[PDB]
Amino acid sequence: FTVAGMFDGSLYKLLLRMALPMFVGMLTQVTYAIADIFWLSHGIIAGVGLVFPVGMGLFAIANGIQIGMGSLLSRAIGMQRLDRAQRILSVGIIIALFFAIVITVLGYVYAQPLLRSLGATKSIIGYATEFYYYSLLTVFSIMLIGVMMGLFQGAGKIMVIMKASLLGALVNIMLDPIMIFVFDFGVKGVALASFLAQLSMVAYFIYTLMGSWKIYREFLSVGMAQMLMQLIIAVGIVIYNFFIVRLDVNAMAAFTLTGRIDYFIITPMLAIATALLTVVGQNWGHGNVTRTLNAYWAAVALAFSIVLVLAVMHIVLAPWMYPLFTRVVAVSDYAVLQTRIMALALPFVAISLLASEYYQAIGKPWYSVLLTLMRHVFISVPVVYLLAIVLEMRITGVYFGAMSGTFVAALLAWRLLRLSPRLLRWNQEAV
């Protein structure tokens, strides 16, 4: 339970030692697709891709369960009640269960209409429906992993998470071949290999692990706020796609190229965020508010610094890199212009995004959502409209408008994260 350096140590050492294992775990996740497509190399079943969004709303909900778990457990530990702690796992599991039932049941009955809003059946439907159904069979297990992730992240034991992750990636590496060759299962088999990978992780956790509406409310409010924030981010990407497409179809193709890469650059900040939840949550429970504030700015210093480097790499690399990805030069031009304009905003995203983690850690999701709304909606939409339409800038106007929310939100974070009477009162009420 202790997690050395938590209450008295160097915050940089503390956050890094926690965030680095978490980052390794995140790299394992990528290997799945690499191994999958490597073995898929040996037009009908390929509507598996149609069902891809469903897998992502499952990780999204699992993620909300994780932070609810992480947030609540880490405050209990810091308060030194391994008391509410065993309660929390219980309530964590029960919440995960009902979420799986509601999702499988509404999944099933509304299956037909839901699938319509994804893809067209002139060729792929029966393939689509089967995979949708197999996806439903994975829900409880995915939710279970959220609980477990939330359990070991709350206790600050990330090595168990990093080792679970590695075991999962090895399993998928070995099984993918066996499903193709021994069992003759095709694409289904690589999917099933990925899934037995996830269960072996689940197994690893439980084996390691061997040896009152108020509390549903506390868990549900943080956890569901996390889901609401995924949503807002997804919606902001929709409104962005809407504008890009109606202006120039090539800019929409450019974004399709930049997206995975823009996402990797941001991952080191997601790793630090996870570490910060534990440190804020536990120091908050222990009553040390100053240290939680120092913890946030230690995290911003790490995250900003790393992402700025990855961002600058992207910008200078883009002119040489993107032409290799496409022969249409309007598409590689748009991708280069987008990166050049928006890339430096990325490290600034750390300021408001870590601010969101802090409020989740201390049980105040309202300000988590406030900062996410401020970043992806309240500023961006009206400013993009202003710059891309009224002022006659077009795609260049989208790029500038869209990143203006990141700056305002960074301003907000900076103002809110500091000693205040209310913040100190909040900690009095907590302990």
Q: Report whether 278 contacts 22 (CB < 8 A).
A: no
17/376 with CB nearer ligand OLC: 376
- Residue 353 CB, shortest distance to ligand OLC, in Å, is 6
Q: Say how far apart CA 204 and CA 202 lie, in whole Å.
A: 5
Query: What single letter denotes the amino acid at residue 273?
Result: A
199/411 with CB nearer ligand OLC: 411
- Residue 410 CB, shortest distance to ligand OLC, in Å, is 4
168/236 with CB nearer ligand OLC: 236
193/412 with CB nearer ligand OLC: 412
194/352 with CB nearer ligand OLC: 352
User: Which positions touch ligand OLC (CB under 6 A)?
Assistant: 233, 236-237, 239-240, 262, 266, 297, 338, 342, 345-346, 349, 351, 376, 380, 402-403, 405-407, 410-411, 414
233/389 with CB nearer ligand OLC: 233
- Residue 267 CB, shortest distance to ligand OLC, in Å, is 11
Neighbours of 102 (CB within 10 A): 11
Q: Where are the beta strands (DSSP E) in 7-112?
A: none
Question: Cα 132 to the chain's mean position, in Å?
Answer: 22
Q: Which residue is nearest to ligand OLC (CB)?
A: 236
176/262 with CB nearer ligand OLC: 262
- Residue 226 CB, shortest distance to ligand OLC, in Å, is 12
- Residue 2 CB, shortest distance to ligand OLC, in Å, is 29
Q: Say how far apart CA 249 and CA 254 lie, in whole Å.
A: 9
Q: Report whether 163 contacts 204 (CB < 8 A).
A: yes
Q: Please, which residues have CB within 8 angstroms of residue 67's CB and are 6 or more apart in sequence?
A: 150, 222, 223, 226, 277, 360
Neighbours of 117 (CB within 10 A): 7
- Residue 409 CB, shortest distance to ligand OLC, in Å, is 9
Structure tokens at 241: 């796609």
Q: Report whether 278 contacts 426 (CB < 8 A).
A: no
- Residue 260 CB, shortest distance to ligand OLC, in Å, is 11
CA separation (Å) from 46 to 40, 131, 136, 139, 177? 11, 11, 19, 22, 19
Q: Report whether 314 contacts 343 (CB < 8 A).
A: yes
